[PDB]
């Protein structure tokens, strides 16, 4: 795990959209609580570029690849002490049997943006804000 100078854990994530119209986004199930949804993402490795970490974590957690788009922003979770670079990713490859599917049975699902914001709100309000 890696950290900013203030001790916040460094993370990266993508908003994995179905298309360039950015109407449908891919969430993945929580590892702790499989009945809940999150935005896929995770820790940056040492010296790892945030865009590289984002794409790698989406591949591991969600089993997708695509065309990397713009940095949306950098988002803090004060409560959990982490700070997340969030990028747009336009999905072009949907893989079966990806890392977390095989290892922890992680699920994924497409959501209209409105619905994504809805299911994120309760446990992951900072993640809901990614879409603002
Ligand atoms: O507190 P939790 O509900 O168990 O959330 C955990 C935890 O997030 P926190 O940093 O807030 O504790 C993990 O972070 P660490 O404990 O490893 O620092 C995070 O891991 P990543 O930052 O690497 O994403 C993991 O997410 P996941 O295991 O899917 O990678 C996520 O669990 P959820 O899947 O329920 O959000
Ligand atoms: Cl879309
Ligand atoms: F995650
Ligand atoms: F992660
Ligand atoms: F991670
Ligand atoms: F991870
Ligand atoms: F990681
Ligand atoms: F990791
Ligand atoms: F990882
Ligand atoms: F991962
Ligand atoms: F993970
Ligand atoms: F969060
Ligand atoms: Mg991960
Ligand atoms: Mg992780
Ligand atoms: Mg993660
Ligand atoms: Mg990781």
| Residue among 8, 32, 98 to mutate when testing ligand 1 (max atoms within 8 A of CB) | 32
Largest CA distance in the chain: 39
Distant-in-sequence, close-in-space partners of 63: CB < 8 Å, separation ≥ 6:
94, 95, 96, 97, 98, 99, 100, 101, 108
Cα-to-centroid distance, 44 and ligand 14 (Å): 9
Give φ, ψ of 61 to 5 degrees: -85, -40
How many CB atoms neighbour CB 4 within 10 A? 14
State the total domains in the chain.
1
| Residue 41: both structure tokens together | 């993402």
CA 57 / ligand 10 centre spacing (Å): 5
Beta bridge partners of 30: none
> Which amino acid residue places its CA nearest to atom 27 of ligand 1?
31
Q: Which CATH number is 54's domain given?
A: 3.90.79.10
| Partners of residue 25 on adjacent β-strands | 17, 111
Cβ atoms of 61 and 41 closer than 8 Å: yes
Neighbours of 2 (CB within 10 A): 13
Give strand ranges (E) for 63-131: 64-77, 82-94, 108-112
Method by which the coordinates were obtained:
X-ray
Residue 126: which domain range? 1-132
Q: Which of 83, 91, 130 is nearest to 110 (CA)?
A: 91
CB 16 within 8 A of CB 46: no
b/e per residue 18-44 (b: at least 16 CB within 10 A): beeeeebbbbbbeeeeeeebbbbbbbb
């Amino acid at each position: 795990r890696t950290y900013d100078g203030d001790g916040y854990k460094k993370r990266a994530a993508c908003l994995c959209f179905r298309s360039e119209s950015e109407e449908e986004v891919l969430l993945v199930s929580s590892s702790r609580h499989p009945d809940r949804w999150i935005v896929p993402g995770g820790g940056m490795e040492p010296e790892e570029e945030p865009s590289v970490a984002a794409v790698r974590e989406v591949c591991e957690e969600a089993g997708v690849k695509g065309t990397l788009g713009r940095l949306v922003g950098i988002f803090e979770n004060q409560e959990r002490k982490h700070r997340t670079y969030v990028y747009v990713l336009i999905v072009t490859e949907v893989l079966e049997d990806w890392e977390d599917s095989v290892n922890i049975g992680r699920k994924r699902e497409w959501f209209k943006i409105e619905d994504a914001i809805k299911v994120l709100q309760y446990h992951k309000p900072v993640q809901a804000s990614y879409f603002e």
